[PDB]
Amino acid sequence: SRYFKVTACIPSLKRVRTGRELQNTFFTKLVPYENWFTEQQRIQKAGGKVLSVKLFTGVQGANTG
Amino acid sequence: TTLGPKIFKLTQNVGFRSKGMVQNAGVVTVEGSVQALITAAYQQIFGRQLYQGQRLKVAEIKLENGETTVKEFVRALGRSEIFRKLYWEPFYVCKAIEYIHRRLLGRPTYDRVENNRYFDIASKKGFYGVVDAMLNSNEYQEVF
Amino acid sequence: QDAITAVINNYDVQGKYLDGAALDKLKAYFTTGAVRVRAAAVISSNATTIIKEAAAKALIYSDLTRPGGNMYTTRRYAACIRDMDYFLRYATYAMLAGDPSILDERVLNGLKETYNSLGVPIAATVGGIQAMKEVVGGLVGPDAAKEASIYFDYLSSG
Amino acid sequence: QDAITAVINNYDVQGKYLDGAALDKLKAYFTTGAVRVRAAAVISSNATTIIKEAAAKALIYSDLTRPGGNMYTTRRYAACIRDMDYFLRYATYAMLAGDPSILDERVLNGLKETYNSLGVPIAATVGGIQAMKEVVGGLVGPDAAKEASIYFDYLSSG
Amino acid sequence: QDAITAVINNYDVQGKYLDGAALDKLKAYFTTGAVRVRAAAVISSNATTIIKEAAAKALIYSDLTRPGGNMYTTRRYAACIRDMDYFLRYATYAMLAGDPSILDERVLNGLKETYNSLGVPIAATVGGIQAMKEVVGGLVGPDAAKEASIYFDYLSSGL
Amino acid sequence: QDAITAVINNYDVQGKYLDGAALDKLKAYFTTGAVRVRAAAVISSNATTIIKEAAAKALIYSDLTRPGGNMYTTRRYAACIRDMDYFLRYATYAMLAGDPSILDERVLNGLKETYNSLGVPIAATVGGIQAMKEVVGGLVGPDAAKEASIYFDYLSSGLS
Amino acid sequence: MQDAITAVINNYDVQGKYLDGAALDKLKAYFTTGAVRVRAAAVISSNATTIIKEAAAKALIYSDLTRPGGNMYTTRRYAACIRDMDYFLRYATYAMLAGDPSILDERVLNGLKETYNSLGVPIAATVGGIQAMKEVVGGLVGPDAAKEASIYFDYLSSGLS
Amino acid sequence: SVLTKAIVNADAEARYLSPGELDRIKSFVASGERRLRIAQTLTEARERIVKQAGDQLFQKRPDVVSPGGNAYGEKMTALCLRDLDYYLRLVTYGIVAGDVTPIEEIGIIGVKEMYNSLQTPIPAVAEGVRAMKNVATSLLSGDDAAEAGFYFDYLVGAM
Amino acid sequence: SVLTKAIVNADAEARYLSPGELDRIKSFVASGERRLRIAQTLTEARERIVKQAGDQLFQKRPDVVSPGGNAYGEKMTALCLRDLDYYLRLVTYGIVAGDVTPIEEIGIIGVKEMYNSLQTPIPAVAEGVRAMKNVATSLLSGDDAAEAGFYFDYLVGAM
Amino acid sequence: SVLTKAIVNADAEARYLSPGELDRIKSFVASGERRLRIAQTLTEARERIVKQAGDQLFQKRPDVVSPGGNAYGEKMTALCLRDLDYYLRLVTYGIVAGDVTPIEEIGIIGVKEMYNSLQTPIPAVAEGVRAMKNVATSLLSGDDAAEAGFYFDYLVGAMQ
Amino acid sequence: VLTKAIVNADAEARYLSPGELDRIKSFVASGERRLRIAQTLTEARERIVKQAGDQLFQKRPDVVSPGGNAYGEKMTALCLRDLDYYLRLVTYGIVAGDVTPIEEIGIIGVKEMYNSLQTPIPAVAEGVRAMKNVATSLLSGDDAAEAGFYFDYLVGAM
Ligand SMILES: *[C@H](C)[C@H]1/C(=C/c2[nH]c(/C=C3N=C(/C=C4\NC(=O)C(CC)=C4C)C(C)=C\3CCC(=O)O)c(CCC(=O)O)c2C)NC(=O)[C@@H]1C
Numbered sequence A: 001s002r003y004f005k006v007t008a009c010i011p012s013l014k015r016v017r018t019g020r021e022l023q024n025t026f027f028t029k030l031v032p033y034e035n036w037f038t039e040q041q042r043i044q045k046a047g048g049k050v051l052s053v054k055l056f057t058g059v060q061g062a063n064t065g
Numbered sequence B: 001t002t003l004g005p006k007i008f009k010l011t012q013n014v015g016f017r018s019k020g021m022v023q024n025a026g027v028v029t030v031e032g033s034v035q036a037l038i039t040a041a042y043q044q045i046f047g048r049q050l051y052q053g054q055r056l057k058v059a060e061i062k063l064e065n066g067e068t069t070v071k072e073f074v075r076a077l078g079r080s081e082i083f084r085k086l087y088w089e090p091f092y093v094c095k096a097i098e099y100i101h102r103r104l105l106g107r108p109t110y111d112r113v114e115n116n117r118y119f120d121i122a123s124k125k126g127f128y129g130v131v132d133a134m135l136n137s138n139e140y141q142e143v144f
Numbered sequence C, D: 001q002d003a004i005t006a007v008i009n010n011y012d013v014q015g016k017y018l019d020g021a022a023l024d025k026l027k028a029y030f031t032t033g034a035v036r037v038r039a040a041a042v043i044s045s046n047a048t049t050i051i052k053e054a055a056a057k058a059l060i061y062s063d064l065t066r067p068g069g070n071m072y073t074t075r076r077y078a079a080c081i082r083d084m085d086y087f088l089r090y091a092t093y094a095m096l097a098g099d100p101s102i103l104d105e106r107v108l109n110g111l112k113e114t115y116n117s118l119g120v121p122i123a124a125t126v127g128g129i130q131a132m133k134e135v136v137g138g139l140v141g142p143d144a145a146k147e148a149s150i151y152f153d154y155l156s157s158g
Numbered sequence E: 001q002d003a004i005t006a007v008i009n010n011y012d013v014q015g016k017y018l019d020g021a022a023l024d025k026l027k028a029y030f031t032t033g034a035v036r037v038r039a040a041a042v043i044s045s046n047a048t049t050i051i052k053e054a055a056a057k058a059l060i061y062s063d064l065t066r067p068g069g070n071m072y073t074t075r076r077y078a079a080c081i082r083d084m085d086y087f088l089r090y091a092t093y094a095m096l097a098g099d100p101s102i103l104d105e106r107v108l109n110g111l112k113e114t115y116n117s118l119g120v121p122i123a124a125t126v127g128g129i130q131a132m133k134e135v136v137g138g139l140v141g142p143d144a145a146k147e148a149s150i151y152f153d154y155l156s157s158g159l
Numbered sequence F: 001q002d003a004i005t006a007v008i009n010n011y012d013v014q015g016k017y018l019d020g021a022a023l024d025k026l027k028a029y030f031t032t033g034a035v036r037v038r039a040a041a042v043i044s045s046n047a048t049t050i051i052k053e054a055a056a057k058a059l060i061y062s063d064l065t066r067p068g069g070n071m072y073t074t075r076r077y078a079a080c081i082r083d084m085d086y087f088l089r090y091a092t093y094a095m096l097a098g099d100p101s102i103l104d105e106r107v108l109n110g111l112k113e114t115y116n117s118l119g120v121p122i123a124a125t126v127g128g129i130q131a132m133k134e135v136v137g138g139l140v141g142p143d144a145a146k147e148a149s150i151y152f153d154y155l156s157s158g159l160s
Numbered sequence G: 001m002q003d004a005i006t007a008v009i010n011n012y013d014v015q016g017k018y019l020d021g022a023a024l025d026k027l028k029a030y031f032t033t034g035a036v037r038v039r040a041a042a043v044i045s046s047n048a049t050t051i052i053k054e055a056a057a058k059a060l061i062y063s064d065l066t067r068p069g070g071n072m073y074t075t076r077r078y079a080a081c082i083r084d085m086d087y088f089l090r091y092a093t094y095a096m097l098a099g100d101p102s103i104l105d106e107r108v109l110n111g112l113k114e115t116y117n118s119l120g121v122p123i124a125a126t127v128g129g130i131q132a133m134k135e136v137v138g139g140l141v142g143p144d145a146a147k148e149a150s151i152y153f154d155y156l157s158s159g160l161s
Numbered sequence H, I: 001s002v003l004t005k006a007i008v009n010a011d012a013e014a015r016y017l018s019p020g021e022l023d024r025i026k027s028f029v030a031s032g033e034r035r036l037r038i039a040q041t042l043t044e045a046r047e048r049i050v051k052q053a054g055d056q057l058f059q060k061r062p063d064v065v066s067p068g069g070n071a072y073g074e075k076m077t078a079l080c081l082r083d084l085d086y087y088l089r090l091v092t093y094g095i096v097a098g099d100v101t102p103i104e105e106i107g108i109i110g111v112k113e114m115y116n117s118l119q120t121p122i123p124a125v126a127e128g129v130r131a132m133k134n135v136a137t138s139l140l141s142g143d144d145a146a147e148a149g150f151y152f153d154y155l156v157g158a159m
Numbered sequence J: 001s002v003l004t005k006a007i008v009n010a011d012a013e014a015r016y017l018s019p020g021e022l023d024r025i026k027s028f029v030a031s032g033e034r035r036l037r038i039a040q041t042l043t044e045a046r047e048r049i050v051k052q053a054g055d056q057l058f059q060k061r062p063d064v065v066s067p068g069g070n071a072y073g074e075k076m077t078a079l080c081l082r083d084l085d086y087y088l089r090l091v092t093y094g095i096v097a098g099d100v101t102p103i104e105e106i107g108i109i110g111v112k113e114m115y116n117s118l119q120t121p122i123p124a125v126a127e128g129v130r131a132m133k134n135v136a137t138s139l140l141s142g143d144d145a146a147e148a149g150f151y152f153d154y155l156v157g158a159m160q
Numbered sequence K: 001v002l003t004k005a006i007v008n009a010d011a012e013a014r015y016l017s018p019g020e021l022d023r024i025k026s027f028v029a030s031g032e033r034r035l036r037i038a039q040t041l042t043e044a045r046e047r048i049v050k051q052a053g054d055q056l057f058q059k060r061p062d063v064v065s066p067g068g069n070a071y072g073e074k075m076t077a078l079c080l081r082d083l084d085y086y087l088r089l090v091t092y093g094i095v096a097g098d099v100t101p102i103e104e105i106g107i108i109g110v111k112e113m114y115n116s117l118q119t120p121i122p123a124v125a126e127g128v129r130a131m132k133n134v135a136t137s138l139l140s141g142d143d144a145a146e147a148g149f150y151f152d153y154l155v156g157a158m
């Protein structure tokens, strides 16, 4: 299946946290093609900015597969 | 609190934190924090540890190298065949949904509105649909 | 965020108390508000048709829909119309808000990059947005249309 | 994906119905198919041994296993044999499929970069893959070996 | 990791059993240990004040705190002092450990990138770390200060 | 389970190797199999229509659909047709399998209790199942119909 | 869960009483026993696999259960039974360290009878296995530790039966 | 294809292909040559199948080719026939693949959404496919027809 | 069985059986009668297959039947042979089922754990199964042998 | 307690206690006898500690014991002293447990909410605890005092 | 021990507790004694391994038998080398005061490594037990108890 590699930065505007949040704040992740749409929305809602999106696996606009 | 159960968070990824010194450490360390979390995943999703064939190493690998995050590891376990075999296939569809709910979201369902939402989804898209809906729920995202 | 909050935020960075000039901008928004609410209701009711008409204007009867085109296959076609809906809903939100920021925060953020990786054509998408604008303009009526147009244009430029 | 689907996909982008020339390619695959199935069953049954033999040929009794070597410590040793298993399983999948793409999609993508960060030695890994190929060749028999070899070589080149 | 584990790891790659020379290095660490523990206790007790003093020296009464500055608004102010506390706590951990590695693994990794996205000013942060070092040096006393300073400097160089 | 597995399981608890008598039961299933596959394909293609026709026969033009009836309101109507689809899909599965067990394990278990809490009328539901059976019988043809009927009857008996 | 120290505290807290000498004596008793318990726990952990093996050999295996038509017949069921045995052992070890039976009630004992009855697992055989584990454990831990270990094993057995 | 499906299940389980799965592959490769011929037959008769099915559909559903109806008008009628042709091409692909997956990706996912935007009635489209099946069946030999029928039925089920 | 596997996949997808899935069922029902005969042959030869395989295994692995080894002693050797018999019975069940699922539930899940508690070496067990395969193959006709081989291979792979 | 914490971590991991965890248990059991003495000392001096702390608090905060203030009046003053006594009892429990958990469950969770309903000022309560600490420290030997201080500090930290 | 304390503190996001600090102090004092215990075993290492090897073989003839993995000079040497490795790890553990050093080098992936080798894991465990008994005899009672814990852990791990 097609996979997305996504790098995004998310700020905690509602509350300050004592524990390290660096993993939460800045993450590079692999997302299934389908899941990415929902994930993109989640980052947007959080108010985080998506620095980079790349298609890790699969071929641009393959008709089937 | 101490009134609660223990909560596991993955604080750091070892994979991307390539040692700046003594690359071939041998003793390394902080491997356990990940390896403990992996054990605790299985304890929450399945309740028990799996048998020797049954575990899914590939998902574990990615989590260890920091390719995926904890969210995605949990996704892989819910999607897994063994999870379907243990909980989806043997039960009445509503009994299934109720049990799956408690494993993935950590509570019983509140109301007929939730139950119906998942029952509907189950009829259009089956076991896969139900599990995705729970993990894609905003409730999931807020708490976990 | 919103026109009201935008004014507030601009003043807050200056540290200035709210002043008459600022108040006038807020007052301007308040008059426009009633029109915007009416427009939003119109758009929501006619949303499915708006998308249909816009697709007919630009997307269908085109190379995109023909085999080897981006919108060829049912899956791709469905994706494109879903995206069109998104743009419409967010534009409606922006019109009520009176601020382009929400478009930047949700719609403009990450979509360009996604599209470039996918190889979706930006110009065709822009064409679709412009088509939606034209259809929307008719339904909302002239006073509302001017307001609606700016948000559609903002999306297109992004 | 697979040989059959590859042909289909190329025709679908053209929009062409399947034609005799296309059919001939499909027919070619169908004849090879029976051999491939037999080979796959052989590999699955002997997988543990194949890995053992290949390790014996290249990996063990070496500096790698000695302290300061990449495969030193139980954890690293176990990782290396796990990787070997992966290569074997995916090569078997590729052989059945008749297509190299699955290797690219799962094994090959990002592996070089991962290995470089880890400091795993690529040449030694390639050596291990080639060793597995030789062992596999014996078990599968000559007709099957040619087909099996190309996928192993594909992994090595990647 | 730790000084003790560092010695062990060096021997393990060689495959050598522990030897007197190695033992001497371990012994060296053990003598320093007592001093380090005393320093750590001092820092923990005075942590709030250390941060206050350092902020007074660099962060406050500045454009940053004034509107339009990075540390303007309560939320941002609180974030900045939280970051300062992190640096202090980790430096204390490093001092006990006798190794800079923990700083690299937790604090230093990805901080620059995070800060750049946030728009936090790195040079000001570095200034704050240096200020904390100076305050810490006083409280811990001279012998402890040398050990404490290296970890603070390590953080500063990373950032 | 399925017929083949049911035979196997009975032998496994005994620990007995498969014997001719067991083989005969398996052989019986194998002959029926081809018919069943054809029937299943027919049902899948005509599933939407089957439900429509069955509803027409029993559920609609009735007090249920009229205001104050259980299937009144769009939400309730949609629920009832969803349930009908479930029954059809599972019956098709059972017919291929040659075993009623799947119906017990998924559909039948807890259904009565669910319906009682909901206040759904069991007798009307049973009526709908019987109607589906009749429609299905026509499409599948006589040989297939006998096999199809038993699973439909099994569902009906369970609900009652 | 609760431990001996906390149990004393809780009893006093409901009374509202400050800790008194009688209470102190109970706490002191625990503290002396503690060192022995820690040693016993380490012994059990190291020999856990063997303990289970020996106990199974004594009761479970070479029996109708393992033979076809028996509860522990088939690999899957066999594996399940030894997993359950391990649970009992681990929890008993936890209880022994704690000095309180409560953890057994909270985790193992609650709903076990009902679960087993639905499953059709035979309770008496399970109890037999627990008793067998106790005997094996007693040997390894040594006499002083054995008395302490035995009570928790017996607690599990009584719960199930 | 059947093969792709089998591989995917194995990969999910992270295991080598099961004997049963392998057996199905063996059966498929034997069947393939016959399948190729069935596909070839339909391709040659494609133009006529579409034409015949179209006017069966229009007779069955007068409304679709009526001023209200979606199909009405030359442009629209052509598009309706184009769609029928598309589905036939997909069916041929399916027969050679031995599985509906190729068909499914191109034609069955998002189909409802696409047609709803177009406003085309989905049941009428299904009737057209049924019509095509009947024409195709007549040209095919009985056993060939049964194979082709399965794929045709899937399409009808999907919409 | 084949049919159970197909149904289960469909239920997960919440769809009717795919044409491809249906085709595999059709093939299986045709194959069944031949499969029954293959199973019958092995059942009749069961006693000899086990005996011959046992001897081969013991020759291949002297250690297992040695004072250290698990198999050593009459009681133990009997149990080892009983295990071989069990696996043969499972293989026959598999052939009639057309899938390894029946085999898998009874024999392959938790097998590692069971044998590890027993301390029986898993590779030796695998060798015994391989030995049984060779004996069984000789009695079976070539095509029959190939079918039987797949199930035997699965067992060897599983352990 | 230390022991409870260790067991809980093990059960989450579903493993036997780690050697490191076992070592901590060993250390705790050795420490316990010393801990018991520290607790005993404070219990005996309890009455005086409360009295002295109360006086200090009232000097520090005249307002609380003033006609406006919550503490004012004999009934109210008694209740304020009772509260101080409660917190001291909790501290003793903490020392024997070796963890703040016993203290935390009884006294620190919902404390804000309880006092807000009562309208008692939380900072004043904190001052009283600080006062008690100072009195307690004087009676305790230095090393004993440090141990006791940690528990006292936690309370002060919890309540603000 | 120090690493463990720091890690717990970091999870809690707090400075090191007094009790935790005290344990660190105790550990540093104990270290010199620990070094001596380790030194003793290092000197006796060659004999401990040899005796334990031989002791184990008496129990289990099968392991060193023509079928068995250990059989033959090359193989027997490798088995003894493995025992030596584990002893070295144990010494490292004693000085560290924690099993972590032991655990990373020897106990993670051990099952997988030995399964590929086909070495029986229980026999390896027996060898470690044997080494413990030899080591205990040379050590004084209190020293032996300390050493025993590390030995027991290894046995538990595999
Ligand atoms: C203070 C000297 C300067 C300053 C700080 C500041 N930081 C943030 C926000 C964040 N900073 C961090 C940093 C860390 N999180 C970690 O886990 C670690 C490693 C242990 C560090 C050092 C992160 C991740 C954030 C984002 C979210 C969060 O709250 O943690 C801010 C807020 C800026 C914003 O708009 O989000 C500020 C102000 N900036 C200054 O003005 C000082 C020079």
Ligand SMILES: *[C@H](C)[C@H]1/C(=C/c2[nH]c(/C=C3N=C(/C=C4\NC(=O)C(CC)=C4C)C(C)=C\3CCC(=O)O)c(CCC(=O)O)c2C)NC(=O)[C@@H]1C
Pocket: A033, A034, A035, A036, A037, A040, A041, A060, A061, A062, C064, C070, C071, C075, C076, C077, C079, C080, C081, C082, C083, C084, C086, C087, C106, C107, C110, C111, C114, C118, C120, C121, C124, C125, C128
């Ligand atoms: C339609 C006007 C054009 C078109 C669209 C198209 N998009 C995708 C895939 C994705 N689109 C997004 C991004 C967004 N769409 C939104 O509405 C929003 C929120 C405002 C976002 C962020 C994403 C994330 C995807 C991929 C993930 C997913 O689809 O779940 C496709 C599919 C491409 C493909 O299948 O390869 C298409 C076709 N393309 C056209 O032809 C029009 C010009």
Ligand SMILES: *[C@H](C)[C@H]1/C(=C/c2[nH]c(/C=C3N=C(/C=C4\NC(=O)C(CC)=C4C)C(C)=C\3CCC(=O)O)c(CCC(=O)O)c2C)NC(=O)[C@@H]1C
Pocket: B058, B061, B062, B064, B065, D064, D070, D071, D076, D077, D079, D080, D081, D083, D084, D086, D106, D107, D111, D114, D118, D120, D121, D124, D125, D128
């Ligand atoms: C063995 C032939 C050689 C070798 C192997 C080795 N690999 C690692 C670590 C990793 N290797 C991979 C690779 C994969 N992960 C996948 O999912 C796939 C495709 C399915 C592959 C091929 C990854 C991601 C890792 C990361 C760490 C992990 O355990 O997951 C190591 C360990 C490196 C370390 O120091 O941690 C080793 C030793 N190296 C050799 O010496 C052989 C020549």
Ligand SMILES: *[C@H](C)[C@H]1/C(=C/c2[nH]c(/C=C3N=C(/C=C4\NC(=O)C(CC)=C4C)C(C)=C\3CCC(=O)O)c(CCC(=O)O)c2C)NC(=O)[C@@H]1C
Pocket: E060, E061, E062, E065, E066, E071, E072, E073, E074, E077
């Ligand atoms: C007056 C009612 C009380 C009082 C106030 C006081 N404040 C300071 C110093 C600062 N106060 C702030 C506060 C803010 N910064 C923000 O961004 C916001 C939100 C918009 C607020 C409210 C800050 C950051 C400072 C630091 C100085 C600076 O801005 O650079 C002081 C000075 C203390 C000192 O000398 O250190 C005082 C006195 N103090 C009282 O006692 C009054 C009850």
Ligand SMILES: *[C@H](C)[C@H]1/C(=C/c2[nH]c(/C=C3N=C(/C=C4\NC(=O)C(CC)=C4C)C(C)=C\3CCC(=O)O)c(CCC(=O)O)c2C)NC(=O)[C@@H]1C
Pocket: F060, F061, F062, F065, F066, F071, F072, F073, F074, F077
């Ligand atoms: C008229 C605008 C369109 C139209 C209508 C149409 N409806 C039916 C049959 C039914 N429609 C309903 C609908 C409802 N029942 C409810 O409870 C509610 C909400 C309160 C609604 C909207 C129902 C239940 C039926 C079934 C009959 C029954 O209830 O007993 C038909 C006839 C179809 C049939 O076969 O019976 C028709 C024609 N048809 C169009 O195309 C018009 C645009």
Ligand SMILES: *[C@H](C)[C@H]1/C(=C/c2[nH]c(/C=C3N=C(/C=C4\NC(=O)C(CC)=C4C)C(C)=C\3CCC(=O)O)c(CCC(=O)O)c2C)NC(=O)[C@@H]1C
Pocket: B092, B093, B094, B095, B112, B113, B115, B116, B119, F059, F064, F070, F071, F075, F076, F077, F079, F080, F081, F083, F084, F086, F106, F107, F111, F114, F118, F120, F121, F124, F125, F128
């Ligand atoms: C149709 C012939 C009859 C009918 C049906 C009807 N059902 C419901 C509601 C539900 N139906 C179910 C049933 C199932 N759950 C399962 O797990 C299975 C087996 C796979 C089935 C069959 C469920 C769970 C619901 C409840 C959903 C909810 O919470 O709303 C209704 C709606 C009841 C309501 O009040 O919404 C109806 C109408 N009713 C009739 O009168 C027909 C005879």
Ligand SMILES: *[C@H](C)[C@H]1/C(=C/c2[nH]c(/C=C3N=C(/C=C4\NC(=O)C(CC)=C4C)C(C)=C\3CCC(=O)O)c(CCC(=O)O)c2C)NC(=O)[C@@H]1C
Pocket: C060, C061, C062, C065, C066, C071, C072, C073, C074, C077, H064, H069, H070, H071, H072, H076, H077, H079, H080, H081, H083, H084, H086, H087, H106, H107, H118, H119, H120, H121, H124, H125, H128
């Ligand atoms: C004919 C059976 C029915 C019918 C058809 C009809 N279709 C359109 C327009 C389009 N149909 C498609 C279909 C596809 N695109 C794909 O990618 C695939 C899968 C390979 C299919 C099947 C598309 C994209 C269009 C848009 C126009 C274009 O071709 O670019 C129409 C006209 C549109 C309209 O109605 O407004 C019609 C009439 N309509 C019926 O009622 C028949 C029963």
Ligand SMILES: *[C@H](C)[C@H]1/C(=C/c2[nH]c(/C=C3N=C(/C=C4\NC(=O)C(CC)=C4C)C(C)=C\3CCC(=O)O)c(CCC(=O)O)c2C)NC(=O)[C@@H]1C
Pocket: G061, G062, G063, G066, G067, G072, G073, G074, G075, G078, I064, I069, I070, I071, I076, I077, I079, I080, I081, I083, I084, I086, I087, I106, I107, I118, I119, I120, I121, I124, I125, I128
């Ligand atoms: C023979 C090839 C190898 C061997 C076998 C061996 N097995 C046992 C004991 C048992 N074997 C089983 C296994 C099964 N029970 C099941 O339910 C199934 C699937 C149907 C299997 C395969 C069981 C349960 C036992 C336990 C005792 C009992 O039968 O009740 C032994 C002896 C007991 C012991 O190991 O102490 C042996 C020797 N051993 C080898 O080394 C051979 C290579």
Ligand SMILES: *[C@H](C)[C@H]1/C(=C/c2[nH]c(/C=C3N=C(/C=C4\NC(=O)C(CC)=C4C)C(C)=C\3CCC(=O)O)c(CCC(=O)O)c2C)NC(=O)[C@@H]1C
Pocket: D060, D061, D062, D065, D066, D071, D072, D073, D074, D077, K063, K068, K069, K070, K075, K076, K078, K079, K080, K082, K083, K085, K086, K105, K106, K117, K119, K120, K123, K124, K127
């Ligand atoms: C002796 C107790 C048992 C035994 C041992 C045995 N081992 C091998 C081969 C290897 N064993 C190891 C072990 C390690 N490497 C490490 O890094 C560590 C951790 C520090 C260990 C313990 C390795 C890697 C090998 C491979 C050889 C090499 O290192 O180059 C053999 C030979 C098997 C072979 O195929 O070569 C043997 C015999 N075998 C028994 O039967 C005893 C019970």
